[PDB]
Amino acid sequence: MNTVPFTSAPIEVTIGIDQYSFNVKENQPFHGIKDIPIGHVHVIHFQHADNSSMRYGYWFDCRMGNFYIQYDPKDGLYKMMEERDGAKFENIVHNFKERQMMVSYPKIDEDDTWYNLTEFVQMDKIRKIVRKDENQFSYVDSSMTTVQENELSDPAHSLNYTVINFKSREAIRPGHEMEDFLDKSYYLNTVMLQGIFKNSSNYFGELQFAFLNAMFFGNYGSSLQWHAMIELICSSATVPKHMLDKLDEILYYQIKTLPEQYSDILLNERVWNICLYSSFQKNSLHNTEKIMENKYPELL
Amino acid sequence: GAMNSSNYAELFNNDIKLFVDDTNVYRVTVHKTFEGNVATKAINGCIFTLNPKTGHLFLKIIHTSVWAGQKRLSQLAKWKTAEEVSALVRSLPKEEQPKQIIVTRKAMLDPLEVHMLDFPNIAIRPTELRLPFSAAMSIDKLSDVVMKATEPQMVLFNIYDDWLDRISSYTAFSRLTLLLRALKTNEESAKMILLSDPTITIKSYHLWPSFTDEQWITIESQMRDLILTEYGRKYNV
């Protein structure tokens, strides 16, 4: 069970760790988060009390190094850093733990929510979507634009999600215009699964990462990517049975976790109505259709 | 964006453009079967592709053989339209290719956009105008070449005959839309107005009669009266 110590908390802030969150007061003696489950990616995230604009945070995996948070009064944010001295880090953590200045990652034993949201998400895939190769952790915020949003302006600060565009030469074989537009199976299976992602696990990893960036940061481009990857599967007549079954589980946990009050901005009416009620896969998402109908019947 | 009353003069500028109307592509008669069920029989159709500036009409005849063994024909008809318009553009020299294609029905936008991906600089636009191009099959010589076709065929016409020798494109388009609007509202009465004087004939190489400038004023008035006479019936006003 790993630890992310905080040097201090000089500004009042709501701190997120995965699906959990804690309010910290200005100069409250808060020195970090312990008992973080090994084996998953995690996200630590921030929203300042004095400017709720820019939710921002860090994707990390404690297997990949010793990470800590320190406030930078010049750039005005909580920064993740790596401590390369193992013994210094162990000694910082042991002291803060002894003084019980750390919150405990509050996982209920029965609760598989975080595993279910991050099942296919891998740090090495995150670091290719979020390019900053000198760090082992990845910064995301509310305002970062996607490569696709930029095409339609600082490339170093972009989310490099895989570009999906239903009206592109990539999506449409010359001579199969109607077939490929109405049945996206060749775009899903040859171009995206065989071609770019190599397998369904990498495709689902990106889908899950996009959702979590949409939910935790209100990142609009991430929400666009999440919906496009759902629509590409639901709009394909030919999808492996294991992928449809896995998609239903993925979406079920995403809809289960979404704050009830954010359904208006994070869910696209057209995509969900098309996916659940008109698409090839209208009958393949039983769990997702039942949670959507019971939790968000207005949207439908 | 959408072509409307506001940007109407754009039709007659020097940027090559085409209107595409798919109304008459998939045509059927509905009938009873022996068992008392209903069935359709397809008849020959056409794509109506028109340069509004020059009057050049690209009439692509759609032979009933293209529907044989196909499903969801009203959907397919849109894609076949977009396939044939794309083929026509690729067949034209670069300097003759349109800069814009305006579709009369919004359902043509995605099919035509997807068929024209190779032409990203050709703008595909809808229109707010209610154009009467469905009535093209009320023009006897167009109807005749469509019905007689035994295979897919492209036939080239000038829908303005020689009018541009005497009038502007704007005025020629207004005359064409008024004639087609009359033929659409009351075909019998419109054709009666166009042929009532036996002395005025249609040249072999023309679609419409050889009216003098003064006779066109009388004809256009008789067409406007027909449209109002008809409207004061539809609505009882």
Swiss-Prot record, chain A:
GO terms for biological process: spliceosomal snRNP assembly; spliceosomal tri-snRNP complex assembly. The gene is AAR2. Present with 7330 molecules/cell in log phase SD medium. Phosphorylated on serine and tyrosine residues. Keywords: Cytoplasm, mRNA processing, mRNA splicing, Nucleus, Phosphoprotein. The keyword Transport does not apply. Heterodimer. Interacts with PRP8 (via RNase H homology domain and MPN domain), competing with BRR2 for the same binding site. Component of a U5 snRNP complex that contains at least the U5 snRNA, PRP8, SNU114, AAR2, SMB1, SMD1, SMD2, SMD3, SME1, SMX2 and SMX3, but is not a component of the U4/U6-U5 tri-snRNP complex. The modification Phosphoserine is found at S236. Changing S236 to D/E: Disrupts interaction with PRP8. InterPro entries: AAR2 (IPR007946), AAR2_C (IPR033648), AAR2_C_sf (IPR038514), Aar2_N (IPR033647), AAR2_N_sf (IPR038516). Residues 244-265 are annotated as: Leucine-zipper. Belongs to the AAR2 family. Its main location: cytoplasm. The keyword Nucleus applies. This is A1 cistron-splicing factor AAR2. It is found in: Cytoplasm; Nucleus. PANTHER family: A1 CISTRON SPLICING FACTOR AAR2-RELATED (PTHR12689), PROTEIN AAR2 HOMOLOG (PTHR12689:SF4). It comes from Saccharomyces cerevisiae (strain ATCC 204508 / S288c). Component of the U5 snRNP complex that is required for spliceosome assembly and for pre-mRNA splicing. Involved in splicing pre-mRNA of the A1 cistron and other genes that are important for cell growth. GO terms for cellular component: cytoplasm; U5 snRNP. The modification Phosphothreonine is found at T257. It comes from the Eukaryota.
Swiss-Prot record, chain B:
Signal peptide: none annotated. It comes from the Eukaryota. It is found in: Nucleus. Changing D21N: Reduced growth at 30 degrees Celsius. Strongly reduced growth at 16 degrees Celsius. Changing D21A: Alters protein folding. Severely impaired growth. Strongly reduced growth at 35 degrees Celsius. Coiled coil: none annotated. Changing T104A: Reduced growth at 30 degrees Celsius. Strongly reduced growth at 16 degrees Celsius. Residues 7-237 are annotated as: RNase H homology domain. Changing D22A: Reduced growth at 30 degrees Celsius. Strongly reduced growth at 16 degrees Celsius. Strongly reduced growth at 35 degrees Celsius. The MPN (JAB/Mov34) domain has structural similarity with deubiquitinating enzymes, but lacks the residues that would bind the catalytic metal ion. Functions as a scaffold that mediates the ordered assembly of spliceosomal proteins and snRNAs. Required for association of BRR2 with the spliceosomal U5 snRNP, and the subsequent assembly of the U4/U6-U5 tri-snRNP complex. Functions as a scaffold that positions spliceosomal U2, U5 and U6 snRNAs at splice sites on pre-mRNA substrates, so that splicing can occur. Interacts with both the 5' and the 3' splice site, as well as the branch region. Has a role in branch site-3' splice site selection. Associates with the branch site-3' splice 3'-exon region. Also has a role in cell cycle. Present with 468 molecules/cell in log phase SD medium. Component of the U4/U6-U5 tri-snRNP complex composed of the U4, U6 and U5 snRNAs and at least PRP3, PRP4, PRP6, PRP8, PRP18, PRP31, PRP38, SNU13, SNU23, SNU66, SNU114, SPP381, SMB1, SMD1, SMD2, SMD3, SMX2, SMX3, LSM2, LSM3, LSM4, LSM5, LSM6, LSM7, LSM8, BRR2 and DIB1. This is Pre-mRNA-splicing factor 8. The gene is PRP8. The chain holds residues 1836 to 2069 of 2413 of the full protein.
